[PDB]
């Protein structure tokens, strides 16, 4: 459980840098000119050096059991076709490999590092069932990881059907995700930018809350 409006700045021990394996060219900084709440947010700029250009800040202060994450997110450039990532969660259910939230085929999705599965399937109907991340303004992004396989995702309070799965929940485009039984067991949440293609973008994060209960959009 952890929250931050960044109005007291960037506490670097609360929100350390993460750049697994390699670190070349990405930046994390407090921005005092772009924000959702108040004056400040966290600005992440991916470096132009493929995967190694990645960078994140994050925390291991995550509850066990149900987890709700909420962040206000501003994206500079529209999501393209390439596979990109802006949230990584080390996952015990994948032996430490990452549950990722990002973009592919111009829309938001989940991705498992272990087997490269996506939620939704990136079929035409799957793509239609998820959404783009609008640019140039802070968006309220929230998700819930349950204990029974449930995953729920909201943008500006509206459920994203393609990015929602779980016991008895009818998602017609969840085949890749549910091939094997998968229940997340995350140990951290990291916010930033990563792209194997070397796609560069700038993403700002403000008003982060991680909790055992639904946060909402204020
Ligand atoms: C999909 C969608 O409509 N997202 C909206 C976005 O257009 C707007 O810029 C933002 C403002 O906070 O609220 C959210
Ligand atoms: Ca703020």
Author numbering: 1 to 218
Give passages from the manuscript.
The filamentous soft-rot fungus Hypocrea jecorina (previously Trichoderma reesei) secretes large quantities of carbohydrate degrading enzymes that act synergistically to degrade cellulose and related plant biomass components. One of these newly identified proteins that were found to be co-regulated with the major H. jecorina cellulases was a protein that was denoted Cellulose induced protein 1 (Cip1). The co-regulation of Cip1 with the other cellulase components in the fungus, and the fact that it contains a CBM, points towards a role (catalytic or carbohydrate binding) for Cip1 in the degradation of complex cellulose substrates. The Cip1 core domain structure is best classified as having a β-sandwich jelly-roll fold.
